[PDB]
Every structure is written in C-alpha cells, then in structure tokens.
Write a protein that binds this ligand. Structure first.
Ligand SMILES: [Ca+2]
Length: 354
C-alpha cells in the first residue's frame, strides 16, 4: 500500500481550515538538493497550492541536487513534499550544511536564530546514535535546542530507521541524537492501516534487519526529564540499567510497505521512514500555531500532561531488528517504540486552545 501526505493527515485527523499561513517552517538538510519547479508540480498533482520555498547556504553548502533519488535528494524532497503538502500556506526555509557535526550544528543554530525567515518550527531528519557525538557537539547542540525553546521554536527530530540498535552494530541498544535530546520532539515510526479517515491498524514499524525499523529506547546520556516520570519509562536495556530520556515522544506512519507516494528527482515512487514523520508533525504544529495566533514552541512537558485520548495509542510490535529479544516493545500508553503514539489533530489542537 501507500498514501499521499493528505491521506495520512486525514488518518491523523489534522484540523481543517489551517494551511500554516503566517508560519515559517525550517528544514535541515545535510547535502543533496531540491528542484523548485519540480516541487511545484508535485503539489499541483496533489491539488495543493505550491508553498513558497527558500534555500539558505550554510558553511559554504547549498541546494545541489545530484539526481540520485537514493542519495540525499530523496531525503531533501521527501522532507519538503511531506510538510509542504500539509502546511502549504506556510513559508519553507531549507538550510543546507556539510554532512558533519559542525555543519549540522551551524545549520540548526542558523535556522533557529534566523532574523529574517524566522521559523517557528524546526524539522530535522538527520542524526546519529548519541554515543558517537563529541561532547562539544552534544553540548552546543543542546545549547541550541535550549535556545529554540526560549525563542518559542518547536524542534522535531526523526528518531531513526534502524530499530533499537540504531545501526550501531556492537551488540548494545542505542538511541539517536538529536532525537534523544529532551528539548526535542522525537518522532518514531509505525505501520498505518487506515481508510476513510478511520484508523484500522497502527503498529510499530519493523520490517526487519533489512526493511528498517523505528528508532526508540532510553538515552543513557540524558536523564529522565521530570515530565516523563509518569510515562513509565524503563531503564535502558543495556547492562547497567540506567535511568534516561525515553525516546520517542510521538510516532507516525513510516513503514515503506504503507509508504508515501512521492516524486523524487522526476520519478514516481513510494517511500517511508521516520524522516517523513518529523516534517509531517511539523505541518501539524504550524497549523496549530496558525489557529492560536501564537507559536507553541516547546511541547514536550505539555504533551505528557494532556489527556491520553489526545493520542492514538500504539500497543503492538517492537523495534528490535537485532535479535528476538523484542527490545523495545510497544504497550499501553508511552512505550519506547512509538512514544505517546500518533497525535489526533483536532484533539491536540482543542487541548491547546486557551
Ligand atoms: Ca503505546
């Protein structure tokens, strides 16, 4: 199967009447590139206004599509098409930086502080397991997310496509950064079966070692935040059992099997992965900021205090691609596969009207 971004949104009941207008959404890109007119073509087919999109060169990098769908272009255009389709009245801001610790950082800090585009939400679909980041990068990164929160900016982050071990093949369980940061809205992945706006089934994304699986777990670097105390986060599965930030916060369709119908470098194709969820939730936020007349910024503490019925709870599956230990597994309420679960659009917004 497969769906357009609009089908997913309708599955998650995104609130109607909101196009994200007046909201600028930033997107972080670590290479590759998009073709403007081509994007403008994709939206038309979806029957949506083509959003205004701008490229910002960071550290000497820029919008440079290579033509390889499977290269960074697939990543760039999936980001813009998924969020562009759902918040088309919003201005889009794409920061390209070199694929590095530093370039990643300067991209995040430039968007966050950008005195002209002024993004209210930041969608990030890049990362690496948190134990592979320097201390310096980790510190500057959190300093930047802190800065986000303070400026009223909502930062979302894909939590990874390589199950509970995150492609760090050493036998232990690992979560990705920046999803692990508590200042970030960590986005996991699921397999959505849905029709007519009603969700039939929504399970943890896990197509095995080779099909990809949502990232998810418990950070042994960032401690359990106060707001996760009632979420029933388990200690890390790794030996030592320490206490830590449960990853993700929210989850949404990412299974390629039930993927997104896109157009990447001219070809029609169906792709999934968690790098689609963060731009997806990025559009929801923008619609909500639009409704309230104010940017919602940092949501994490709020989210964990809202009524559970604000979310579609995912209770079946596990994100273990490494073994048959079923680490970690989905369950009632918060779980280290899907978080609180998939947000219910109208419900999220209702609970945020003051
Ligand atoms: Ca659950």
């Amino acid at each position: 199967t497969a769906y357009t971004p609009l089908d997913v949104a309708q599955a998650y009941q995104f609130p109607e009447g909101l196009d994200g207008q007046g909201q600028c959404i930033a997107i972080i890109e670590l290479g590759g590139g998009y073709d403007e007119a081509s994007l403008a073509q994709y939206f038309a087919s979806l029957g949506v206004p083509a959003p205004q999109v701008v490229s910002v060169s960071v550290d000497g990098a820029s919008n440079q599509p290579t033509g390889d769908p499977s290269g960074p272009d697939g990543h760039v255009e999936l980001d813009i098409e998924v969020a562009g389709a759902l918040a088309p009245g919003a201005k889009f801001a794409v920061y390209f930086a070199p694929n590095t610790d530093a370039g990643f950082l300067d991209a995040i800090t430039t968007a966050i502080h950008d005195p002209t585009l002024k993004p209210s939400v930041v969608s990030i679909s890049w990362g690496g397991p948190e134990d592979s980041w320097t201390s310096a990068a980790i510190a500057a990164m959190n300093r930047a997310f802190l800065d986000a929160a303070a400026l009223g900016v909502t930062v979302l982050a894909a939590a990874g496509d390589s199950g509970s071990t995150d492609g760090e093949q050493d036998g232990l369980y690992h979560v990705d950064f920046p999803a692990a940061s508590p200042y970030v809205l960590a986005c996991g992945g699921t397999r959505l079966v849905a029709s007519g706006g009603r969700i039939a089934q929504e399970t943890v994304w896990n197509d095995g070692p080779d099909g990809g699986a949502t990232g998810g777990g418990v950070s042994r670097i960032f401690p359990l935040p106060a707001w996760q105390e009632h979420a029933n986060v388990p200690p890390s599965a790794n030996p030592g059992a320490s206490s830590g930030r449960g990853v993700p916060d929210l989850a949404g369709n990412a299974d390629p099997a039930t993927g997104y119908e896109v157009v990447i470098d001219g070809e029609a194709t169906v792709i999934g992965g968690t790098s689609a969820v963060a731009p997806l939730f990025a559009a929801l936020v923008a619609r909500i900021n639009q409704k309230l007349g104010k940017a919602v910024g940092y949501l994490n503490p709020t989210l964990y205090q809202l009524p559970a019925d604000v979310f579609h709870d995912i209770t079946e599956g596990n994100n273990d691609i490494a073994n048959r230990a079923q680490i970690y597994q989905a369950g009632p309420g918060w779980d280290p596969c899907t978080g609180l679960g998939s947000p219910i659009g109208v419900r999220l917004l209702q609970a945020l009207l003051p």
